[PDB]
Amino acid sequence: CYFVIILNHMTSASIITLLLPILIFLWAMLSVPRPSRRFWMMAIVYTEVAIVVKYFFQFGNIIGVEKKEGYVLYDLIQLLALFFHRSILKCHGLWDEQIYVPIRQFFYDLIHPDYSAVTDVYVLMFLADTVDFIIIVFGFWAFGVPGPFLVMVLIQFGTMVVDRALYLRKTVLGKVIFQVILVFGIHFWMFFILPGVTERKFSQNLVAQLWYFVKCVYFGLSAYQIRCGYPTRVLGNFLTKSYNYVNLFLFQGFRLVPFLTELRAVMDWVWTDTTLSLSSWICVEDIYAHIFILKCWRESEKRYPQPRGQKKKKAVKYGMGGMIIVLL
Amino acid sequence: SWICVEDIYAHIFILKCWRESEKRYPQPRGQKKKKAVKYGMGGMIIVLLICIVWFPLLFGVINQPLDVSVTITLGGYQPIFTMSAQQSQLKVMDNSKYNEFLKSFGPNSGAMQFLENYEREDVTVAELEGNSNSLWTI
Amino acid sequence: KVSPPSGIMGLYASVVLVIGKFVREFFSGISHSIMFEELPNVDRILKLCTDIFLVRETGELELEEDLYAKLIFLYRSPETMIKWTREKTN
Amino acid sequence: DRILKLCTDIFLVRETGELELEEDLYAKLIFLYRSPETMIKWTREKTN
């Protein structure tokens, strides 16, 4: 039902199909055990009212509240999925169980829970963000030298940086505050500013649709991370614990990015309780990286030994030589 | 040898300066690195990098036609018709008449938004009265 | 509406890659230059360099050669440089 | 293995927050890389 609502919104840029996913990302994915029946009932009656209202205006705008043509297919699928979920919740025992006080209590128990099932999903968040970055940079060739994509990639870089910052300090209140800001920012900027300036209708820009979809995926991952909590060990590198060809090659590929490794080291140093200058930090990181690569090569040459100075196999020699030749 | 000596002397002098500095402003032990200097250096590196990579990616008046002219000709002979107009038969569309223009294309399917890019000034009309000005002297 | 009057992408990309390669020098080859940075009490090496300069100023080139040989041998062995740049605490 | 051990201990101590041990271990690592002979003596094959 989450995916069908997100798709209904990606196919229609109205304001009601915009009001609903905000409640999805701020109320559904933040309840502790599971979303309450109140939210499901509200979503059901909201889809009902939307279907009714979109029907009346077939007799007789600038924002694109409705087109008044074609089908209401997506609303039908949305309602059917909501009722399906309600029915299979009632099949189990999950169903059936002035305004500042409830929100205060809710956010308080979310920030200070009785128990926290701590887990780390930060790597998935960063993978979603870097896929979004690949999309936003390859959009240069097709959609918003242009103007809007500049500030778009700028705020993307900024949100990635501040997200890593929030992750290092293992803060939760900061994470929920950042989620609340970022959801409103992204939605308003994507459905009230982008479709107007140097842009056709949003329902025809596929790149923006994929960007929005992966950003909703990132929003869901961040909401999950908030719901569970943060562990106590968030310092070790992501892929330095196997000593294998996969680790070695992925680590080399990670180091091949021009402005990523040193930026990573600086960002780790600036938000970590340490007592070393920046130069000492850089020296330690350099030493650790080289020693790790050497350890990987040592383990490799241990696992696949060669007896003595017989030869170097003609296959690998020819391969490397031809590779260097074709590269040159 | 001269270059080696100068290099050694420069590096040793810089190291001596840093030693004297860390002697004059000591810090007790591994308490912390003050958040102020850490934030300062981090933000400085960040703004330097974004200025290096981003700033290279940084980078109307209405008019009216003074003369209009039309020429119709047959094959490769002298033109049979030629006519020009200037500032008198050039009508700027009256605002009310411009509104009747706007709604005149009501039953049109998808050419109204094409003209909605303009205003009542960048669209004018040119009248060409009757006969041809020049003769026909083949 | 006439507006008043108002390749390089390749050069931009090239200079960005070159600047990235240059920045990498501050992070990939630092462990190599540790024998010449973490030095406490460098007063003796600075003394030797100042004596070299003073002898060169005077014109007694034999002492200049001797002191230059001493400095070269100092930088030609890390262990004697450690033994030579101790903290000298008394 | 020993240098990797030392770096991992540095990282773990930094994670915990006992910065005195961090300073001691960083000094040890700096002195390790500040003399090749003790690095040879410290990275022997350790065959038994």
Partner: peptide, 20 residues
């Protein structure tokens, strides 16, 4: 002192003990 102790390395750190 911070700067005094951060550079307090010597040979006796790398002894052949390896006390396992």
């Amino acid at each position: 002192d911070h700067a005094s102790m951060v550079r307090s390395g010597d040979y006796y750190l790398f002894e052949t003990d390896s006390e396992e």
